[PDB]
Design an enzyme around this catalytic site. Structure first.
Site, PDB file in Angstrom:
ATOM      1  N   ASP A  87       7.130  16.044 -17.691  1.00 14.66           N
ATOM      2  CA  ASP A  87       6.581  15.996 -18.420  1.00 14.66           C
ATOM      3  C   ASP A  87       5.411  16.460 -18.319  1.00 14.66           C
ATOM      4  O   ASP A  87       4.799  17.537 -18.471  1.00 14.66           O
ATOM      5  CB  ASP A  87       7.080  16.059 -19.888  1.00 14.66           C
ATOM      6  CG  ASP A  87       6.240  15.584 -20.751  1.00 14.66           C
ATOM      7  OD1 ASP A  87       6.281  16.596 -21.389  1.00 14.66           O
ATOM      8  OD2 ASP A  87       5.951  14.354 -21.335  1.00 14.66           O
ATOM      9  N   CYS A 111      -1.198  10.601 -26.538  1.00 13.10           N
ATOM     10  CA  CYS A 111      -1.805   9.152 -26.706  1.00 13.10           C
ATOM     11  C   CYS A 111      -3.235   9.355 -25.659  1.00 13.10           C
ATOM     12  O   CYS A 111      -3.487  10.277 -25.846  1.00 13.10           O
ATOM     13  CB  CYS A 111      -1.346   8.231 -25.365  1.00 13.10           C
ATOM     14  SG  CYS A 111      -1.170   8.538 -23.430  1.00 13.10           S
ATOM     15  N   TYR A 164      11.151  11.239 -33.400  1.00 12.81           N
ATOM     16  CA  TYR A 164      10.661  11.394 -32.238  1.00 12.81           C
ATOM     17  C   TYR A 164      12.188  11.332 -31.080  1.00 12.81           C
ATOM     18  O   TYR A 164      12.153   9.873 -31.025  1.00 12.81           O
ATOM     19  CB  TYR A 164       9.663  10.504 -31.566  1.00 12.81           C
ATOM     20  CG  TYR A 164       8.634   9.963 -29.700  1.00 12.81           C
ATOM     21  CD1 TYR A 164       8.663   9.257 -29.146  1.00 12.81           C
ATOM     22  CD2 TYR A 164       9.137  11.236 -29.478  1.00 12.81           C
ATOM     23  CE1 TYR A 164       7.335   9.283 -28.881  1.00 12.81           C
ATOM     24  CE2 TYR A 164       8.496  12.060 -27.888  1.00 12.81           C
ATOM     25  CZ  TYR A 164       7.883  10.143 -27.735  1.00 12.81           C
ATOM     26  OH  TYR A 164       7.271   9.902 -26.369  1.00 12.81           O
ATOM     27  N   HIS A 181      11.148  11.790 -23.831  1.00 14.74           N
ATOM     28  CA  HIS A 181      10.628  10.080 -23.143  1.00 14.74           C
ATOM     29  C   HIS A 181      12.128   9.318 -23.044  1.00 14.74           C
ATOM     30  O   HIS A 181      11.674   7.980 -23.387  1.00 14.74           O
ATOM     31  CB  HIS A 181       9.079  10.005 -23.625  1.00 14.74           C
ATOM     32  CG  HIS A 181       8.916  11.121 -23.592  1.00 14.74           C
ATOM     33  ND1 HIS A 181       7.927  11.165 -24.184  1.00 14.74           N
ATOM     34  CD2 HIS A 181       7.781  11.995 -22.068  1.00 14.74           C
ATOM     35  CE1 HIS A 181       7.477  12.437 -23.980  1.00 14.74           C
ATOM     36  NE2 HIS A 181       7.583  12.476 -23.090  1.00 14.74           N
TER      37      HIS A 181
HETATM   38  C1  LIG Z   1      -3.138  11.484 -22.749  1.00 13.20           C
HETATM   39  C2  LIG Z   1      -1.428  11.391 -23.017  1.00 13.20           C
HETATM   40  C3  LIG Z   1      -0.710  10.339 -23.378  1.00 13.20           C
HETATM   41  C4  LIG Z   1       0.586  10.763 -24.080  1.00 13.20           C
HETATM   42  N1  LIG Z   1       1.849   9.795 -24.929  1.00 13.20           N
HETATM   43  C5  LIG Z   1       2.277  10.752 -25.490  1.00 13.20           C
HETATM   44  C6  LIG Z   1       2.515  10.051 -26.629  1.00 13.20           C
HETATM   45  O1  LIG Z   1       2.229   9.197 -27.570  1.00 13.20           O
HETATM   46  N2  LIG Z   1       4.179  10.710 -27.344  1.00 13.20           N
HETATM   47  C7  LIG Z   1       4.733  11.776 -27.221  1.00 13.20           C
HETATM   48  O2  LIG Z   1       5.036  12.641 -27.169  1.00 13.20           O
HETATM   49  N3  LIG Z   1       3.788  12.526 -25.925  1.00 13.20           N
HETATM   50  C8  LIG Z   1       2.765  12.455 -25.004  1.00 13.20           C
HETATM   51  N4  LIG Z   1       1.968  12.906 -24.321  1.00 13.20           N
HETATM   52  C9  LIG Z   1       2.772  13.727 -23.306  1.00 13.20           C
HETATM   53  C10 LIG Z   1       2.349  15.073 -23.935  1.00 13.20           C
HETATM   54  O3  LIG Z   1       2.918  15.044 -25.483  1.00 13.20           O
HETATM   55  C11 LIG Z   1       3.074  16.345 -23.116  1.00 13.20           C
HETATM   56  O4  LIG Z   1       4.642  15.874 -23.646  1.00 13.20           O
HETATM   57  C12 LIG Z   1       2.060  16.393 -21.185  1.00 13.20           C
HETATM   58  O5  LIG Z   1       0.806  15.436 -21.376  1.00 13.20           O
HETATM   59  C13 LIG Z   1       2.166  17.334 -21.628  1.00 13.20           C
HETATM   60  O6  LIG Z   1       2.023  18.742 -22.047  1.00 13.20           O
HETATM   61  P1  LIG Z   1       0.215  19.526 -21.417  1.00 13.20           P
HETATM   62  O7  LIG Z   1       0.973  19.814 -20.395  1.00 13.20           O
HETATM   63  O8  LIG Z   1      -0.216  20.193 -22.128  1.00 13.20           O
HETATM   64  O9  LIG Z   1      -0.908  18.139 -21.385  1.00 13.20           O
HETATM   65  C14 LIG Z   1       0.820  12.280 -23.985  1.00 13.20           C
HETATM   66  C15 LIG Z   1       0.337  13.154 -22.928  1.00 13.20           C
HETATM   67  C16 LIG Z   1      -1.109  12.813 -22.967  1.00 13.20           C
HETATM   68  C17 LIG Z   1      -1.981  13.608 -21.997  1.00 13.20           C
END
Ligand SMILES: Cc1cc2nc3c(=O)[nH]c(=O)nc-3n(C[C@H](O)[C@H](O)[C@H](O)COP(=O)(O)O)c2cc1C
Ligand SMILES: Cc1cc2nc3c(=O)[nH]c(=O)nc-3n(C[C@H](O)[C@H](O)[C@H](O)COP(=O)(O)O)c2cc1C
Ligand SMILES: Nc1ncnc2c1ncn2[C@@H]1O[C@H](COP(=O)(O)OP(=O)(O)O)[C@@H](O)[C@H]1O
Ligand SMILES: Nc1ncnc2c1ncn2[C@@H]1O[C@H](COP(=O)(O)OP(=O)(O)O)[C@@H](O)[C@H]1O
Ligand code: SF4
Ligand code: SF4
EC number: 1.5.8.2
Lengths: 729, 729
Positions: free
Chosen positions: A267, A30, A169, A172
């Site tokens: 996550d 997001c 998807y 979550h």
């Molecule tokens: C601002 C934000 C919003 C998120 N929204 C989603 C989303 O729309 N769909 C999704 O599958 N994961 C969402 N994620 C989760 C990320 O896909 C990811 O699983 C999580 O941030 C961990 O990855 P990272 O540790 O590299 O940030 C979101 C993460 C962030 C940073």
């Protein structure tokens, strides 16, 4: 030059009919744009494409109006208008040679449908544990066929929009996972019971999607391999690996996560609880049984860690979300060996807090351009060069001051940054010392590293730390063309708080038994056994001090007049924080505030203690019966966390003596950061970034307009539609 | 014909250079449209213009980016794009001979500025008691000049947009009120201290606005005459009346309110606490000292009450917000003497809950077309007439079935409405009997009145109440062309809840010591002294039952696994509800749920009792230390409020026997309301209204698409602006 050990991160990798140019992959996440802010969506993703990332994905993309996340913002691929809007993003991403992906989403009862008002469908009827007033209809066989069709139709529009990667998807705790997980699925037909049955909905959907666009698109699936709740939900070595074996032939790439939706902080691990690579134990279990490329996020920002998981066979691709926000150019910097220019994510989750709040755009504590690329035209690595020789004096080297310094230096100005403190970082140097907040120092480490190297490019620029406090006279006669006052804020010492906006009788941090957060962190002032933390702030200070003190052996009680750790709900830190305070035996007295303080004791009252009935009783008398819930509680030490105030004395003096500015050739003096108004570190950083970018404007104190992405009356969202009011009569 | 006594309500009244055609005035109020949804804005206001309202105002309208309410949605008059979008509304309103108004707003620290990221300014620096993390900069003399200029520019833009009335908004503790109120204003200069100094900011602003557009527009001011907090804030007979005397010569009309922003439910009085005309004691004090037209809201729906305040000299105009949402045609119905056609607002505040949540469009429990006028083309008083003779059978006369019946009859279909219950209303008949919810009856009184009247227009239609429960065979052989199953929902009897989605061991409402909400409201089953309410619902049921039982002498303890009465924060009932429970000595045990129940006792646990640290320990084992907070509590009676489930047995049977429909000449069967999925009464009503309107569509079970108001990539919001990405380099 790049360290040869990192060459493996730049080898291409085949995912079905597509090829990733390197191992850097931005998983779906997001940003607060969806299909509603096409400019923001395309700019934010394309700068990353320019930055080297092999593939860029949108956030969860609703396949049909009955999966509407309002009040939260998701992307949407409902009709032709969505196809048009999202294509702006795929076109711009393709321009820089990267692939574009979309995450097909159907949320079940987790989607509140506040805009559409439609009825969500699920495997069984349940009220979402996330959206507690949202219920779904149990699906019959035709409901199943219909929803599967939504996925097919969405996949087709995605191809039309230019997407190279289409996800089904299942993370979550969204639809496909709801059918797989017995926590939701209570069916007794062929879609419930045994794993074969529970997996059926997902397997059929994958097959149908592959059949529709599998020749043109890579088919990926995001899977929550373990819900991290133990037996009762999905366990990696039980259903987890078995489902992977079953679906392996239908997928081109596995994108793995852990956790559910109510606690997706498991996550998106906050640095407060999890280190980089925290997900490895679960993620590697997938590679062990899959024959397709696997990737699994874990807040990866270090190339050394990245090569470790790849060479050790834990994953084949480096999936990132937050690391890509903090630094859109992370891949390029690693390729070029510019390791010290990498802006490392501090795992604060403030970006996420915006999505959770519902509706507002994303912001980033490290990267002040995130979300500003399109509307303000701010590229994170490109700065407009000055044509003049103006020098700038910046008083204060905290988040705001140091960022302003960094940007001005990047722009070619001569800057003089000064502070009484010995190091760059301001209040953040104390904050990162709080339990679990160690990684927040990367914010200051980055600015220190950058400012130092930038000083080498202009000998007229200077860094003066450990200095005497600047005074009005010192500033007026310094000789700089412009001055930026970034003097910060301090925690209130008299009980002043948001509830009354007045001091609390008896509150005085100069007394032996009362302390402010600063006094606690300096660790000089003695603290007694029984500690009471009086709180009126909704973020991290009170719970962080409570944790610090309880671990040191004190008996802590938090009296909170506002919802304790409220903002932590949005950063996803709340659940684990409450568990931490609970294991430390921290007592919480919510819905209570303080009316007066005495040595060793304070009078508190329930904030809902006044009479419920309102009656007009004339002037001088309250319209409700008196609050009589007052009671005294004792303490050895009282820690005041009631609020903050701007440290703007210097500014006030300079302003009073404004007539003298001209005489001293001072073209302008600007107030930024916490000194203007106490803010979140992210916004303090933003103010510094903004005055630096707009230092040449008519009035750098106030921001110039940004491009607005709002519908223009007379223009229909649906191509060829009628925008006028048409009543069905 | 209209009762002569009501003739006075139709006399015109001069307000400055403008004339109101009658005394019906829609004061400014949110609808979730602002300047972002021009269609929704123009349609919703114009239907009321057509309905006879003399003047229609927008909701609070931001004068500048530094007063941005995101995440909440307000109107905006920042630039030309806004003027264009808002003109759509004024044009449409003028088309029906009504005046249009705009409410100029600057919020101070109350505006969180999540989109703009700008810094708000106020009389002194404070943290908003409403937005606890939002602080403002203390204004100096140039700040004051600049902000006043914002108002002037907004007023000028407003005139260009075609507005006839321009407000300087000083209610709900917004800017002008912040300068007048000592609670916020701690200044020691000419803008603080004495009343004349405290009133200076507002006086100057009024004067500059009048000078800029006073010859073309009527100048009104909205004023919170008493903050209803007693001494410390504004009191009607102290500063209140005096400010009115000071400003009287500058304003053309006074729009009066009471209360602040944190608790504006004191203004938008919920029927649960306040009756129609509850604001009179305060409002009348203004007419006492003013020489200009006065108006003050008070949930006025009754013409008898409306003439009372006017003839008694309490007000000159009838200002309404909610009453106009429930019935856009209230004025016309009074004018024509059709008193029984008036759709009376129940004061549920669900419309408001949508604004508070932030972002979603408004919905109304009474009027299912509110928010649907533009996007669905649904006019509240005009229905497309059927061209066929189809008859429709509707099983269930609750909110959904009765509304479907009403709309079908209005459309000309033959309708057969049946229920086992003695009267129309369904579960609403039990709900309106809860303490304070008596006015919710108006929802069923209205439908009873309309259905009864509509039966007269078609003798083929029938109403059959007090009947035996309809069975599948009964439905199959009934003879109707289409059938609508609206059988409702019931509260769970086995402990099933959103947290686990499973029953709770030992939960059984048939046992002598356990009850469901229905059993409590029927009042037949005996209830012991010590009552424990087990809650997992976030709206009104648990609190209302607690109030009912406590007032009856029971000792009540609420064990809540979800945030108690969370949704009431949005409906503005929360503050007074909590005070009520406190007066009644109701004990609350939040953050706790139930693992098992036995006779006379239940085992509870803290939901944050698991260990904070997550460690992969393989399958079969939880990744967190075990929760050991379990303890047992006793009770005489346990009330279960864990969730609801759809009563869809009849539906399930009919679906199983779908092959038999054709032979019985049944063209289709549809599932609506709570029977499809437990919803809020407002949405249950919406489902019935929708199937009725779309009965002739291909698949009435699923809604046809609505017009979307989202920007189209390629079209800039700023006329003549560039929509492409442009980096400042
Ligand atoms: C601002 C934000 C919003 C998120 N929204 C989603 C989303 O729309 N769909 C999704 O599958 N994961 C969402 N994620 C989760 C990320 O896909 C990811 O699983 C999580 O941030 C961990 O990855 P990272 O540790 O590299 O940030 C979101 C993460 C962030 C940073
Ligand atoms: C949905 C809704 C949103 C509101 N937002 C505003 C607003 O933007 N500006 C304002 O001055 N008052 C606002 N109000 C308050 C109303 O103006 C009014 O004071 C309140 O609802 C009492 O009037 P009533 O009793 O006739 O509904 C709002 C009320 C409603 C119903
Ligand atoms: N008169 C002064 N001269 C020099 N440095 C100052 C002066 N007053 C305050 N400072 C420094 O300004 C810095 C403010 O930083 P901080 O509180 O982190 O603010 P921000 O969050 O706005 O960056 C502090 O490091 C403080 O030492
Ligand atoms: N088999 C049936 N035959 C007739 N009426 C029924 C039958 N089953 C339930 N009902 C009625 O249907 C109505 C449902 O109303 P309610 O619970 O208020 O639902 P909604 O909120 O969906 O309108 C109740 O009045 C109930 O008596
Ligand atoms: S807001 Fe924080 S967690 Fe998010 S990308 Fe930026 S530094 Fe990382
Ligand atoms: S939602 Fe409720 S309070 Fe609001 S206008 Fe409708 S009936 Fe009235």
């Amino acid at each position: 030059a790049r360290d040869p050990k990192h060459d493996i991160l730049f080898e291409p990798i085949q995912i079905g009919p597509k090829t990733l140019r390197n191992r850097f992959y931005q998983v779906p996440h997001c940003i607060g744009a969806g299909s509603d802010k096409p400019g923001f969506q395309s700019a934010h993703r394309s700068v990353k494409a320019e930055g080297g990332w092999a593939a860029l994905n949108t956030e969860y993309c609703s396949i049909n109006p009955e999966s509407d996340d309002t009040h939260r913002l998701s992307a949407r691929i409902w009709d032709e208008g969505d196809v048009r809007n999202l294509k702006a993003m795929t076109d711009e991403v393709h321009k820089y040679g990267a692939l574009a992906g979309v995450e097909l989403w159907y949320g079940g009862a987790h989607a509140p449908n506040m805009e559409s008002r439609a009825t969500p469908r699920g495997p069984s009827q349940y009220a979402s544990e996330f959206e507690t007033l949202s219920y779904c209809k149990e699906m019959d066989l035709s409901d199943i066929a219909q929803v599967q069709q939504f996925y097919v139709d969405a996949a087709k529009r995605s191809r039309d929009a230019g997407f190279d990667i289409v996800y089904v998807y299942g993370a979550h705790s969204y639809l496909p996972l709801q059918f797989l997980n017995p926590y939701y699925n209570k069916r007794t037909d062929k879609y419930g019971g045994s794993l074969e049955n529970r997996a059926r909905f997902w397997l059929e959907t994958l097959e149908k999607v592959k059949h529709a666009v599998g020749s043109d698109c890579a088919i990926a699936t995001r899977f929550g391999v373990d819900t991290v709740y133990g037996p009762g939900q999905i366990e990696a070595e039980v259903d987890g690996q078995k489902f992977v074996e079953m679906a392996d032939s239908l997928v081109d790439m596995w994108d793995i996560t852990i956790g559910d939706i109510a606690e997706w902080g498991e996550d998106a691990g906050p640095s407060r609880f999890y280190q980089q690579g925290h997900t490895i134990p679960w993620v590697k279990l997938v590679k062990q049984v899959s024959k397709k490329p696997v990737l699994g996020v874990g807040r990866y920002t270090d190339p050394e860690k990245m090569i470790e998981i790849v060479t050790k066979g834990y994953a084949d691709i480096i999936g990132c979300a937050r690391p890509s926000i903090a630094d859109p150019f992370l891949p390029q910097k690693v390729e070029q060996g510019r390791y010290d220019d990498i802006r490392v994510c501090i795992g604060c989750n403030v970006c996420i807090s915006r999505w959770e709040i519902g509706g507002p755009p994303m912001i980033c504590t490290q990267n002040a351009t995130a979300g500003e690329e399109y509307r303000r035209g701010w590229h994170p690595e490109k700065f407009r060069q000055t044509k003049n020789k103006d020098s700038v004096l910046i008083v204060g080297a905290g988040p705001s001051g140091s960022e302003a310094a960094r940007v001005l230096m990047e722009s070619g100005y001569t800057v003089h940054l000064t502070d009484t403190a010995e190091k760059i970082g301001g209040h953040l140097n104390q904050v990162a010392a709080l339990p679990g907040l160690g990684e927040w120092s990367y914010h200051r480490d980055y600015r220190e590293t950058q400012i130092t190297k930038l000083l080498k490019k202009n000998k007229e620029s200077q860094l003066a730390l450990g200095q005497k406090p600047m005074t009005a006279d010192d500033v007026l006669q310094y000789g700089a063309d412009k001055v930026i006052i970034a003097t910060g804020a301090r925690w209130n010492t008299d009980g002043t708080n948001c509830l009354t906006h007045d001091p609390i009788p008896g509150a005085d941090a100069s007394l032996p038994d009362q302390l402010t957060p600063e006094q606690v962190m300096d660790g000089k002032k003695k603290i007694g056994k029984r500690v009471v933390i009086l709180n009126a702030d909704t973020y991290f200070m009170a719970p962080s001090l409570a944790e610090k003190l309880a671990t040191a052996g004190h008996e802590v009680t938090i009296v909170s007049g506002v919802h304790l750790a409220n903002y932590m709900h949005f950063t996803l830190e709340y659940p684990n924080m409450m568990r931490r305070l609970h294991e430390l035996h921290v007592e919480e007295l919510g819905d209570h505030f303080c009316s007066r303080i005495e040595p060793g004791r304070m009078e508190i009252y329930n904030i809902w203690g006044d009479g419920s009935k309102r009656t007009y009783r004339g002037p001088g008398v309250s319209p409700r019966d008196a609050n009589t819930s007052h009671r005294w509680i004792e303490f050895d030490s009282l820690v005041l966390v009631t609020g903050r105030h701007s440290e703007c004395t210097l500014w006030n003096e300079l302003k009073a003596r404004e007539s003298e500015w001209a005489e001293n050739d001072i073209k302008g003096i600007y107030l930024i950061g916490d000194a203007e108004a106490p803010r979140l570190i992210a916004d303090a950083t933003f103010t510094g970034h903004r005055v630096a970018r707009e230092i040449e404007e008519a009035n750098p104190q106030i921001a110039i307009p940004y491009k607005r992405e709002t519908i223009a009356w007379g223009t229909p969202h649906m191509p060829g539609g009628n925008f006028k009011i048409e009543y069905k009569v």
